[PDB]
DNA sequence: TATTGAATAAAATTGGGTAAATTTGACACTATAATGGGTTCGCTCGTTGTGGT
RNA sequence: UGGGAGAGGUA
């Protein structure tokens, strides 16, 4: 994962019951942001018709 | 034309037998967008729709509407038949209730009513005839003699006429003839007229 | 001046039958000798019927 | 289309 800095305190209720608030600058600079390659496939198959 | 494709999709999920299935587009149409035009074709055109589908058993409880329709109409229409316009109140809202709900039983008369499907033909109305085929060589085909080609009882318009005359027992059948039975086949030809304004009401909407 | 009930003739229906097609189900393919089978566990706890000195 | 196993996971 990544280094984040952290600070412990209640903000609004926005982090209430183990929620987390996180700045807009670790979705700017792209740190959590994950790849997920996914395979479709496409079979010919001899039908009888 | 447009409208017995919504009788096939009102059927439950039935199983396919084929190879690879599931073509995945939007080719003819999908099978809840016919009953969300079946929806919005229903503010004009319910008659049809309601009396379809009372006639065809699917959702069997529309014959109810279909027969309530059918009863608006004969209280709308029932002022040029002189024997029902000289009767009173309930007892012609009970006369109309009776006729109402024999034109649409002979309306939904078709090979597929228990107890009216021909002895000989099984329905298909259309019998081999083995003298031709003796003499041709191939196989022919003929009319049912029974059945007379149309593959099912009729029903008598007198089965009314014996309903209504345990409520009018002074109506007997030459006046039954003369200024009542217009009214029933007056409500059968409403009955088909409504069906076939609906099916094209559903293809005005499903175009 | 109509309209309606008794009578009515023509057509549709219906129950029964019936001679003739036609479908159903079953068979049918043959000789050296050969002669008794492969499954199942530490997988706890309450209930209930069945069988036993 | 959509059925059954087995495995892992979340609260
Ligand atoms: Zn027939």
């Known amino acids: ?33 994950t790849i997920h390659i996914q395979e479709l496939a496409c079979v010919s198959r001899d039908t009888k018709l | 034309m447009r409208l017995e494709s919504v009788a096939k999709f009102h059927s439950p999920k039935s ?23 079946m929806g919005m074709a229903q ?6 729709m309601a009396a379809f589908c009372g006639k065809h058993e699917l959702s069997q409880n529309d014959k109810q509407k279909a027969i309530n329709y059918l009863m608006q109409f004969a209280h709308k229409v029932s002022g040029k038949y002189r024997g029902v316009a000289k009767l009173e109140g309930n007892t012609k809202a009970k006369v109309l209730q009776v006729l109402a709900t024999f034109a649409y039983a002979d ?10 499907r021909c002895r000989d033909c099984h329905g298909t109305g259309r019998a081999v005839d083995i003298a031709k085929t003796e003499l041709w060589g191939r196989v022919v085909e003929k ?11 009729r029903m008598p318009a007198s089965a009314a ?47």
């Open chain 1, 1 to 33: 994962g990544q280094n984040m800095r952290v600070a412990f305190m209640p903000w609004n209720g926005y982090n209430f019951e183990d929620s987390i608030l996180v700045s807009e600058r670790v979705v700017q600079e792209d740190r959590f942001t």
């Open chain 2, 15 to 37: 199983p396919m037998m084929s190879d690879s299935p599931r073509a995945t587009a939007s080719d003819s149409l999908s099978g809840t967008d016919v009953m969300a035009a």
């Open chain 2, 43 to 48: 503010s004009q055109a319910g008659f049809g």
């Open chain 2, 107 to 116: 309306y939904c008369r078709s090979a597929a009513t228990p107890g009216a």
């Open chain 2, 143 to 153: 009319e049912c003699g029974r059945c007379k080609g149309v593959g099912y009882s």
């Open chain 2, 161 to 207: 006429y014996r309903a209504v005359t345990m409520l009018i027992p002074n109506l007997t059948q030459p006046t039954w003839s003369r200024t009542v039975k217009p009214l029933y086949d007056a409500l059968v030809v409403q009955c088909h007229k409504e069906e076939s304004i609906a099916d094209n009401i559903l293809n005005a909407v499903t175009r």
